[PDB]
Design a protein around this ligand. Structure first.
Ligand SMILES: Nc1ncnc2c([C@@H]3O[C@H](CO)[C@@H](O)[C@H]3O)n[nH]c12
Ligand SMILES: Nc1ncnc2c([C@@H]3O[C@H](CO)[C@@H](O)[C@H]3O)n[nH]c12
Lengths: 229, 229
């Protein structure tokens, strides 16, 4: 059984490598450094894609075609779009959308691309397992729609826009592309995020502050799940 | 010698398959249908990625890791940002940038992503060869910076913005990601585009009109180049 674990930033995967505490082989490919090791009976490939949609797509595809993972778990941080989501909160993506896609000129709804779809779904069984665990350690796991684009979101306007147009709970920059690629290759994917800011004028400050911690929380949970696979 | 030929839309590759007039095997992978055939002494893999940055990244990576192409030539249409570029004109990308990337909140210049770069360069030798040929058939080949994002551009404002911020000549939605991936894998890439609109309020109309033709022109040239490899 092969499992792929992804993060966007180095900070986000460092805790992961530690929690697994196993020796990791380093395999460079496509500008990414993949950490390959063995944990229990499962083979785990870890890596940080780097920021954005292009980076994340590239890395997920490589992960699938070169290492042939069978599952993909993503952990990272995200900004909040709603009240009931607060710093350090954990969220599991139900559907993801690319909020910055705009073929409006062709009278298409926002987020739509011909031969594609607005919303991408994630693994039913993985998400189920996430809720099980979250309920086994009294962790308040919130689930919902995550919006992804290549813009760091930090303004009240854009905030309201994502909520009204897509009814999204969280915003980030790699979820959707990751989920998209996995769907194309039929790989079950789970996208987990930990709030690190509220995507407002002060999101930048708040983000620099909670990155480390929020990254960790997310990592702990993800390790919990791998243990159960 | 393996060569990869990419287009964004089916319309754009259909002419290509014809001009080569050889039988093509159809190999589906990742939601894309790859056309594999033999032309002269070279092996050519053709395909349309579908629209956008995520689609184009996904497809280029697959093309490289599963088929191991050694070169990548892209042909498609683009909107114009400057006067000296008109409908049906042919352009060869010198540098490409993702104009919709914004980490400004972190006091970064637009288009910049940590561990990356704003501008991506394309193949020096391929572009050279493009100019040779263009000069062998009295074709006015214009060269320049191409801007790519996940928004169909059609407004005077955005127009001025791409020019002033990046000094771009053309705008589209797949060039940069394609060039990026190739650079990461060290594959020489050439991005050729044929104007199909002026990226203004009427870009949508003009586009529906010239798509077919502009797609063809671009295809003819690209076939000319493959003949010389
Ligand atoms: N409010 C926000 N808007 C867009 N992305 C993010 C993020 C995530 O943090 C990184 C931006 O520095 C990037 O990987 C993105 O997914 N946190 N908060 C965000
Ligand atoms: N003015 C414009 N702005 C953004 N993309 C395009 C295009 C290209 O045509 C397609 C949009 O329908 C897409 O593949 C894009 O690269 N033509 N004109 C464009």
């Amino acid at each position: 059984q092969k499992i792929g674990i992804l993060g966007a930033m180095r900070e986000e995967i460092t805790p992961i490598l530690e929690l697994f505490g196993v020796d990791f082989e380093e395999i460079p490919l496509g500008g990414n450094v993949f950490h390959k090791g063995v944990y229990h009976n499962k083979e785990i490939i870890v890596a940080y894609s780097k920021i954005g949609k292009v980076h994340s797509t590239l890395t997920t595809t490589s992960m699938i075609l070169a290492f042939g993972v069978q599952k993909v778990l993503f952990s990272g941080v995200a900004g909040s779009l709603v009240k009931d989501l607060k710093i350090n909160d954990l969220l599991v993506a139900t559907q993801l959308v690319q909020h910055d896609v705009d073929l409006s000129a062709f009278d298409h709804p926002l987020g739509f691309i011909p031969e594609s779809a607005i919303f991408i779904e994630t693994s039913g069984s993985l998400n189920a397992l996430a809720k099980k665990i979250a309920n086994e350690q009294h962790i308040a796991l919130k689930e919902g729609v995550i919006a992804s684009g290549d813009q760091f979101v930090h303004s009240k306007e854009r905030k309201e826009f994502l909520v009204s147009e897509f009814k999204a709970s969280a915003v980030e920059m790699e979820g959707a592309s990751v989920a998209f690629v996995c769907q194309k290759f039929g790989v079950p994917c789970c996208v987990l995020r930990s709030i690190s800011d509220n995507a407002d004028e002060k999101a930048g400050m708040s983000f620099d502050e909670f990155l480390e911690k929020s990254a960790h929380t997310s990592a702990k949970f993800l390790k919990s799940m791998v243990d159960e696979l």
